[model samples]
Target: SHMEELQNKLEDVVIDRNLLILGRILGEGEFGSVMEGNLKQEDGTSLKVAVKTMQREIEEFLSEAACMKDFSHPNVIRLLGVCIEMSSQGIPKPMVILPFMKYGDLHTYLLYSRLETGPRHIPLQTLLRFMVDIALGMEYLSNRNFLHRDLAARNCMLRDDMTVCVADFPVKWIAIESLADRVYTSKSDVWAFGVTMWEIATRGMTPYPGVQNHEMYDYLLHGHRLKQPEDCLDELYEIMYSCWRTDPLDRPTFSVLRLQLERLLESLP
Candidate 1:
């Protein structure tokens, strides 16, 4: 009966495959791609959505769907629904449906800003705004007792209004305790948030640029941390550094971080 209840819960969030029409691929990965889609609603109007194809087992997808189905927040991307497409090969393909974000992800936006044609280098105030939005989103999620196992710039999106929302849901940005003992807490997410802040500050440069993948554990073990971005405010860098403290309990909660970021923004012109 308990298993049946779990099945029912997942079914509640499932979208009818017939109602979803997949469009152009927005971005592709080794196994699947995120695509643009049109979800025909019960109102006879179609809503534009982002469809993320998953190569994993349906059970895994269902669990994550269950997790986000009830989440409601302005800074967090809502999980509209999920669909299982029957491929010609007879295999069921899992798809995660989310509201379409026109500007794509925050990572790309930051990287593109460096180019002449891209939006003139994003202003510091705007960058701090992005960080604050994410902190607020993370604070809400953290308050709800949910830990974002993957939190980073690439997983955040920019809406049409330029508001940033935490989305998708990475490894290089993990906490030292997580790497050493396989332990993960909200602090680990906070640690990742610090890296994401660096991303915004540096306009999306890769984290720990010179360190190899295997060297990260030792890097953090030695008490080293991400260096301040060029021209980064000392106060801002201090906030980021707090997230990397060796003691997870010593790290500021997302609520505290959000306030810190907001105060920093207020201090700016």
Candidate 2:
């Protein structure tokens, strides 16, 4: 019955003016479901798209859409467009479209593949590359005065060719508002990036291991840092530590991080 209902709904949808539903569901989230689809122009070249549905009442969805609409970066996921239409029940729903990545999210790959088992640590080169990708994406966001408030391994998606793209902008906070509200800053993103770096280094281990969320917060307040494993390079550890510094201003910008990661990678064995 579900399949029949979905099919009927799919059939009622019309395609033209640059959009068409391709296949079934690609993924789902609390706000909406993501469907794999295709977008084309009169020239006939098609692009893979992910369509995300959301209820109109959610403020975060609109905030995310506004943040993404102006974002453009090679390593960041691109926003195609959004659809806001009334459903059969006359409830206003919004749908966001983005480029669909084929190889799936970093979490799923790390959990299922042998990639996580070998060495107990990702090679320095591999980790550096991933961090560089994240830095580039972050740099782009920061330059545009946007902070990706939620940066983590689970929010990254890899393509079939091993290229990484940042996804899930649910927690993005604009810089101007943050200066007034003091709610979020680029430094918060730096902290998140440090956790992401830890994830890459340990092949997806939880950042604080046995520590709880509140403990992490308290520990961080007391000037404690995540212990670095011996196998990880010293320079990499330095970068991570700088990112998690107590003062937000003490943390380096993503541009600085990109340079540091580049230098570290260059010195690797």
Candidate 3:
């Protein structure tokens, strides 16, 4: 897999400090690419890091990098370091570095395991735990007035113990501006989070299957919204629905959603 290649590249760099090449390319995105690498410290504690680089022309790269630097939450991915290196032609390239997860991304894991086929379905307790962790992370961001433009299972990572951790802060930013007069707000984040909750509930189903991207926009514009599954508990379904309301004012903040989930967890058997 590509992750193995990234790991190898990282090991090669670890042996030679001047050797900037890492082992393998773990992943790539519109902004740039991510590679697995080792951080060699003076104390001989070699830690792994996920290095994300960006093309110089992309403004969102700098925006996301700056946002990650300011975000400090236990569930959020930690920014380890950054590199501002020049290419062979002396072109400056910026890269954001962070700790790497051994278990890989949540989406990849689900896809590879075929959504965990077996008689033992994903336990409700496990799903609750995952949702709680994500809510806590999102609450932390909401408290700081930050908006995670894109929130989905693909943006989450699981630890060795199967605990979820929020990653890929490329579309995140501080919400200092107002959305009332033609601006973005934390409400947008809530909407995305609702879609994330849908992903969790369905185990990674697309939000609107068979619907074109443009149709999604048009449908949403016309007030068409997602419906909760009948089998879902009332409280949980309400929380999901509230997060995706067309009117921003009708959406629940992460803080509110966290409290709701906590209460729901307490009431469950």
Candidate 4:
């Protein structure tokens, strides 16, 4: 019964392979790779996009894409379409098509700002703007009752104009309750958002300098949290800290955080 509904939805978003031309590789991991691509539109125009290819986990990929099929937000990366290609081994490979963010991931962009050849030093105001953009996007998703179990700096992308858009998701910035009982909620997303805000404030320094990724759950359980970034405004840090409250109910909602960040950005010169 359920399969038909999912299958029907997937079929609607599938694009003809003939309409897509895969280009240079953008990034890759153990699972698969992301490649630059050009998708020819019906209007005879080519649109720049990033295509992520994966060999295994076809069902996983399909479900994720299906869930994202109807999302539309300026601060959220949109799904252009999807393609399924058969491999030499007779397996059906999956590819997800998304917009090509000119500047790539926000984490890499923040790190680049520290280098000599990068886009000069990013000011505090700009960093706050990035946080605000994420807050807005998260607010929208939360309103729709969607829980992004994976929300981090690396999951956010930078547009050509330096604007940030929430992209693919992952782990590492997880909340305590989420780690404890595998319960994910908007509060958990809020917790990850706090870590992402720290990532932006620190200009992309890895979270928990000496703490390993595996140690994150225990670290949070022991009443530990991210320290305030050097030169970070006390007000800003306070807002971020609120997201880490042990009681999920105590954590502020995305709408509240967005307003707080917006007010902070406004108070700046």
Model 2 lDDT, full chain set: 0.71
Question: Least accurate stretch of 10 residues (summed lDDT) in model 3?
Answer: 170-179
TM, every model: 0.92, 0.80, 0.79, 0.92
Instruction: Using lDDT, rank the candidates from best to worst.
Output: 1, 4, 2, 3
lDDT, model 2, position 227: 86
- Residue-pair clashes per candidate: 0, 0, 9, 0
Worst ten-residue run, lDDT, model 2?
Answer: 170-179
lDDT of 2 by residue, 165-244 (tens): 88876221112233335578777788788878877777767667676654544555566667896688787889988887
lDDT of 4 by residue, 164-220 (tens): 888775346888898889988899999999999999999999888888888888888
lDDT of 3 by residue, 27-119 (tens): 787677888887775685777777777754534454455556657777777666556677899776777667778877766665555434522
What are the runs in model 3 whose C-alpha is more than 4 Å off? Answer: 1-21, 55-67, 113-120, 170-182
Error of 2 at 166 (Å): 1.8
Model 4's alpha-carbon lDDT is 0.89
Higher-scoring candidate on lDDT, 2 or 4: 4
RMSD of model 2, in Å?
A: 8.6
Candidate with top lDDT is: 1
RMSD in order of candidates: 2.3, 8.6, 8.2, 2.5
Better of 3 and 4 by lDDT: 4
